[PDB]
Amino acid sequence: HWGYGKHNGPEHWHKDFPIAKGERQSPVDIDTHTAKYDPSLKPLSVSYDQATSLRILNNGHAFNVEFDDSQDKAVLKGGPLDGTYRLIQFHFHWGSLDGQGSEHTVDKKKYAAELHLVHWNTKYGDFGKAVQQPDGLAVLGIFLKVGSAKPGLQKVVDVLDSIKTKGKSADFTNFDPRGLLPESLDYWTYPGSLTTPPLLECVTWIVLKEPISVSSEQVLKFRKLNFNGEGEPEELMVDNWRPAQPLKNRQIKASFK
Numbered sequence: 113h114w115g116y117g118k119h120n121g122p123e124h125w126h127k128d129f130p131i132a133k134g135e136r137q138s139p140v141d142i143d144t145h146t147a148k149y150d151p152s153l154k155p156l157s158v159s160y161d162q163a164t165s166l167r168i169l170n171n172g173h174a175f176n177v178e179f180d181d182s183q184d185k186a187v188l189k190g191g192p193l194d195g196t197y198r199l200i201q202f203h204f205h206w207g208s209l210d211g212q213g214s215e216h217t218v219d220k221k222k223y224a225a226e227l228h229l230v231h232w233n234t235k236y237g238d239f240g241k242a243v244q245q246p247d248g249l250a251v252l253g254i255f256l257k258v259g260s261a262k263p264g265l266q267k268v269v270d271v272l273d274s275i276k277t278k279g280k281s282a283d284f285t286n287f288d289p290r291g292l293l294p295e296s297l298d299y300w301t302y303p304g305s306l307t308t309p310p311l312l313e314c315v316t317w318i319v320l321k322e323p324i325s326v327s328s329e330q331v332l333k334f335r336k337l338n339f340n341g342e343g344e345p346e347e348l349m350v351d352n353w354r355p356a357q358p359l360k361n362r363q364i365k366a367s368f369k
């Protein structure tokens with residue numbers, strides 16, 4: 113099974129999933145000088161007040177927070193998107209040290225970690241059908257930089273020690289995802305893929321310009337998780353990110369000047 117180690121890492125993924133060498137792979141470096149403004153882009157509309165969190169779990173690749181996506185309760189629309197996209201879950205990527213951690217980069221600069229809020233296109237009826245469509249998913253990427261503590265992240269990090277090993281889960285109710293967003297909704301956007309196997313190129317990427325701030329104490333909690341299952345030799349869950357892929361002619365657009 114794939115992972116982030118030397119023998120099952122990103123350099124190996126292409127063998128089981130050839131698309132790893134596709135034309136629209138993610139993540140990528142965002143060069144502020146070549147990412148131009150696109151007027152056809154509409155205002156980004158994030159509607160999370162109706163969000164119903166269900167649980168939080170460790171799948172061995174990171175930890176996910178899932179939401180009830182049976183109704184158009186927590187949705188994403190506007191921007192470069194068509195119709196509605198329902199939030200289904202969010203997770204993070206981080207490094208072995210504060211200097212690295214994010215997947216995307218801004219003018220070659222990495223942040224301490226990165227947040228991925230995953231949504232699927234409701235026109236495909238179901239998540240399963242969505243991931244297999246070029247425009248099936250919309251992922252809202254948000255950078256995390258070390259500084260002040262993010263009040264809204266407290267609940268998440270406080271539970272981690274209860275799901276240290278791969279396979280552990282726990283009920284996670286009443287979490288409001290709005291507490292993880294920065295002040296500004298300014299963003300960059302491009303067509304790409306999942307940053308992990310099966311690496312399908314079904315993602316419209318929306319990366320926020322403004323990073324949210326999290327304390328050193330908070331990020332360190334992430335590094336307490338384990339890739340491995342209970343009872344197995346500990347393999348700390350750090351550096352669960354994928355190297356940047358070639359842009360290969362795709363255009364990164366910005367919602368601002």
Ligand SMILES: COc1cc2c(cc1OS(N)(=O)=O)CC[C@@H]1[C@@H]2CC[C@]2(C)[C@@H](O)CC[C@@H]12
Pocket residue numbers: 201228230240243251305306307308309310311
């Ligand atoms: C939530 O966003 C992801 C979903 C999936 C993967 C990685 C993901 O992370 S990311 N960094 O945002 O690209 C890899 C496994 C992906 C799953 C999408 C749905 C799939 C295709 C299921 O149908 C089976 C395996 C699943």
Ligand SMILES: [Zn+2]
Pocket residue numbers: 173
């Ligand atoms: Zn897996």
Ligand SMILES: [Zn+2]
Pocket residue numbers: 203204205228307
């Ligand atoms: Zn991700």
